[PDB]
Amino acid sequence: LVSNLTLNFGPQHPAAHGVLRLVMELSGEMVRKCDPHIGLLHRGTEKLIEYKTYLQALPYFDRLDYVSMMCNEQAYSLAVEKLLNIRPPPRAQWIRVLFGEITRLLNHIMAVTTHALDIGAMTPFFWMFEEREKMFEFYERVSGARMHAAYVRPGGVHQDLPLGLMDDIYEFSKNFSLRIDELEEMLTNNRIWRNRTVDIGIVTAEDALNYGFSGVMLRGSGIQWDLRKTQPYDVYDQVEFDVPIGSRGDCYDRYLCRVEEMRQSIRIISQCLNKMPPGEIKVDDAKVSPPKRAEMKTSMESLIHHFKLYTEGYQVPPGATYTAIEAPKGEFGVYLVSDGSSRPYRCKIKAPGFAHLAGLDKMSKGHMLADVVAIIGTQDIVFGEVDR
């Protein structure tokens, strides 16, 4: 400890992931100890949900990982369906998988662009954020909200895709692969980019597993693991894609796992615009998913359900469950107890960042100060999920 610095992100640089107050110890330029202080964005989400019905609680999940909106909703929905012992219909499962990979595009565009922003490479941020816009419109037209949809729900989705949407989604996918090449042409082979990333933040396979790392923080270390291919949930047992794998387990690989994954999604989206079946989009069980308006305004048996399902909510059998999904950042998952009534008794959330951030100290040992910038970004941290 030559001198300790309490590096605070008060003047939040354009990161859009929260503010981190970091407490460090520089033995000159090296970092002998890095200590994160996180609670700045703890709002009490895990305790508010105790007072909300299972439906009312859903919007909270768009607000944990606010760059992976629909992905979160899928995790919460899968958990509840599993508790309710019901299966959504195939068309919904395809829409959810369709958007689950569109969101992954939104998230990885955020991670790479900002991570490249914190290191001064600014131009790629604008180019790719013009693709996010067009990707929001798809979010916009199916739910009405640019960012926070609440579209996915226990028992399927809310509304069906408006006519002519998939024509646009196909059009968007057709041109996108050129966009990435416009990006890799900047960062992939650029010597400056390699200098800031090569052999930085190396994590051994054995340590990653113990430290709880998941997602691209594993596959960078050469581990072959991705919940989609190993514990598939909706349809992922019906799509051909290859899981990228790292070699040296440093920043540059994790930059290539993410860029590579963004391609593999265009390989999945392409498949979901072809295999999408006709049918309805919510479980045909009017005690869980509310009935159509036209039937609500005509039939008594339906009117009652539209009443209870929007005031008391739908009970849930008592039980506990841990459900996780390969969210873009890592292994997002929720341990959710249920006491039998309409309000969950407890909702623990396993934010992927929370595990990674603990490992920040480990990865920053024997690294210069400016590497702590790169290390935080490569973990793809958003402090909505970390603090909750």
Partner 1 sequence: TYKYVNLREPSMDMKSVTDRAAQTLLWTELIRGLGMTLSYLFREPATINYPFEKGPLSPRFRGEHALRRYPSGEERCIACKLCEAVCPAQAITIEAEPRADGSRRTTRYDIDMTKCIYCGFCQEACPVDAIVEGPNFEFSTETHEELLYNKEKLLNNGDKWEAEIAANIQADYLYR
Partner 2 sequence: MNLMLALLTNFTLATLLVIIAFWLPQLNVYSEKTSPYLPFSMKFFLVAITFLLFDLEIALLLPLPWASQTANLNTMLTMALFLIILLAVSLAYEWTQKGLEWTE
Partner 3 sequence: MFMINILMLIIPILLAVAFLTLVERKVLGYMQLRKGPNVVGPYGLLQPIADAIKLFIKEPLRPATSSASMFILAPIMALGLALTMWIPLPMPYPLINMNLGVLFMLAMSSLAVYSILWSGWASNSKYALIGALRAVAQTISYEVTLAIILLSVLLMSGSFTLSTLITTQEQMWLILPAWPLAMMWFISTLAETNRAPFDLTEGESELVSGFNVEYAAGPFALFFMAEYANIIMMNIFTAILFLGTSHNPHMPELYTINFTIKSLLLTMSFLWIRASYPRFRYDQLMHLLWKNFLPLTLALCMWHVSLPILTSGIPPQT
- Tokens 């000159």, located at residue: 28
Burial (CB < 10 A; 0-12, 13-18, 19+), residue 13, is exposed
Residue 199 partner contact from partner 3, partner 2, partner 1, none using kind-dependent CB cut-offs of 5 to 8 Å? none
Query: Counting contacts by CB under 8 A, is residue 14 touching partner 3?
Result: no
Q: Which is nearer to partner 2, 23 or 223 (CB)?
A: 23
Q: Hey, what are 257's tokens?
A: 């796992």
Q: CA-CA distances (angstroms) from residue 229 to 226, 233, 274?
A: 6, 10, 21
Burial (CB < 10 A; 0-12, 13-18, 19+), residue 167, is exposed
Burial (CB < 10 A; 0-12, 13-18, 19+), residue 159, is exposed
Query: Counting contacts by CB under 8 A, is residue 2 touching partner 2?
Result: yes
Query: Counting contacts by CB under 8 A, is residue 130 touching partner 3?
Result: yes
As measured in angstroms, the least distance from the Cβ of 278 to partner 3 is 39
Task: Determine the Cα–Cα distance for residues 219 and 101; give it in Å rounded to an integer.
Answer: 18
**The one among 55, 147, 186, 223 contacting partner 3 by CB under 8 A:** 186
**The one among 47, 307, 348, 366 contacting partner 1 by CB under 8 A:** 307
Residue 2 partner contact from partner 3, partner 2, partner 1, none using kind-dependent CB cut-offs of 5 to 8 Å? partner 2
Determine the straight-line distance between the first and last CA of the chain, rounded to whole angstroms. Answer: 33
Which segment (24-32, 41-49, 74-82, 201-209) binds partner 2 by CB under 8 A? 24-32
**Which residues have C-beta within 8 Å of that of residue 304, sequence separation ≥ 6?**
none
Query: Counting contacts by CB under 8 A, is residue 16 touching partner 3?
Result: no
Inter-residue contact 246 to 220 (CB < 8 Å): yes
Strand order in the sheet with 319-326: 319-326, 331-338, 346-350
Residue 266 partner contact from partner 3, partner 2, partner 1, none using kind-dependent CB cut-offs of 5 to 8 Å? none
Query: Counting contacts by CB under 8 A, is residue 192 touching partner 2?
Result: no
Q: Hey, what are 48's tokens?
A: 């508010």
Residue 85 partner contact from partner 1, partner 2, partner 3, none using kind-dependent CB cut-offs of 5 to 8 Å? none
- Was 71 annotated as part of a binding site? no
Which segment (22-30, 40-48, 201-209, 244-252) binds partner 2 by CB under 8 A? 22-30
Task: Determine the Cα–Cα distance for residues 24 and 21; give it in Å rounded to an integer.
Answer: 10
- Was 34 annotated as part of a binding site? no
Query: Counting contacts by CB under 8 A, is residue 202 touching partner 1?
Result: no
Query: Counting contacts by CB under 8 A, is residue 44 touching partner 2?
Result: no
Task: Determine the Cα–Cα distance for residues 364 and 231; give it in Å rounded to an integer.
Answer: 33
Which segment (32-40, 49-57, 336-344, 373-381) binds partner 1 by CB under 8 A? 49-57
Query: Counting contacts by CB under 8 A, is residue 19 touching partner 3?
Result: no
Query: Counting contacts by CB under 8 A, is residue 195 touching partner 3?
Result: yes
Q: Which is nearer to partner 1, 248 or 365 (CB)?
A: 248
Q: Which is nearer to partner 3, 205 or 373 (CB)?
A: 373
Size of site (CB under 8 A) for partner 2: 6
Task: Determine the Cα–Cα distance for residues 286 and 254; give it in Å rounded to an integer.
Answer: 45
Inter-residue contact 193 to 256 (CB < 8 Å): no
As measured in angstroms, the least distance from the Cβ of 131 to partner 3 is 11
The continuous run of DSSP H or E covering 321 comes out as strand 319-326
List of residues contacting partner 3 (CB under 8 A) = 5, 7, 9, 11, 13, 29, 116, 119-123, 126-127, 130, 186-187, 190, 192-193, 195-196, 368-373
Known binding residues for [4Fe-4S] cluster are 251, 257, 272
